[PDB]
């Protein structure tokens, strides 16, 4: 399709065109500093995914339950009716909580995995 | 890499405020660095009216 082509589509029709907005991230002084900056932003996003256990995936399911105080809309009110921009404008004050919960859950899963893999 | 230019195709947009029919482009059109005072020369014309 194209870059941001699903920007105006609902959240359930924009979760299929993910490999198209992912590949177009493409990862004297004025340009080189922005190439390095783009690399740094890409690597920070990859590091976030990795710390969460989502490395190598574009759609990653986690073990963190959804708190109704973050958003109390039903699935048919989010995936079918809202766009990703409206969702970002909704859940934005809470990303510093969700990200912390995701890394804590991954740390617990990693320690449980090394304990299970040392059982025998 | 990592950024996008969001063009505005509303033919009667003034410049400030909400714009619908927004397009995404990779590059702008050819913009001439014309230096002129009082009168703008060799620019683009409005699609609909002044």
């Amino acid at each position: 399709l194209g870059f941001l082509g699903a920007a105006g589509s609902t959240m359930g029709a924009a979760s299929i065109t993910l490999t198209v907005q992912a590949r177009q991230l493409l990862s004297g002084i004025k340009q080189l500093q922005t190439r390095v900056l783009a690399i740094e932003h890409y690597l920070k996003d990859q590091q976030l995914l990795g710390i969460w256990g989502c490395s190598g995936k574009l759609i990653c399911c986690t073990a963190v339950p959804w708190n109704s105080s973050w958003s109390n809309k039903s699935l048919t009110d989010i995936w079918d009716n809202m766009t990703w921009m409206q969702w970002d404008r909704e859940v934005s004050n809470y990303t510093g909580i969700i990200y912390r919960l995701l890394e804590d859950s991954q740390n617990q899963q990693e320690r449980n995995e090394q304990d299970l893999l040392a059982l025998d | 890499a990592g950024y996008a230019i969001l063009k505005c195709n509303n033919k009667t947009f003034n410049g400030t405020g909400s714009c619908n029919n927004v397009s995404t482009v990779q590059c702008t059109h050819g913009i001439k660095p014309v230096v002129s005072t009082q009168l703008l020369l060799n620019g683009s014309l409005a699609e609909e009216e002044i």
Partner: peptide
């Protein structure tokens, strides 16, 4: 009953300022 699913590549953007490069400087 609902859980956090992390998506990467969503069509979401924020306002920002970068050093866009000319291209008459690099062929278009």
């Amino acid at each position: 009953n609902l859980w956090v699913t992390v998506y990467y590549g969503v069509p979401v953007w924020k306002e920002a300022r970068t050093t866009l490069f000319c291209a008459s400087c690099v062929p278009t």
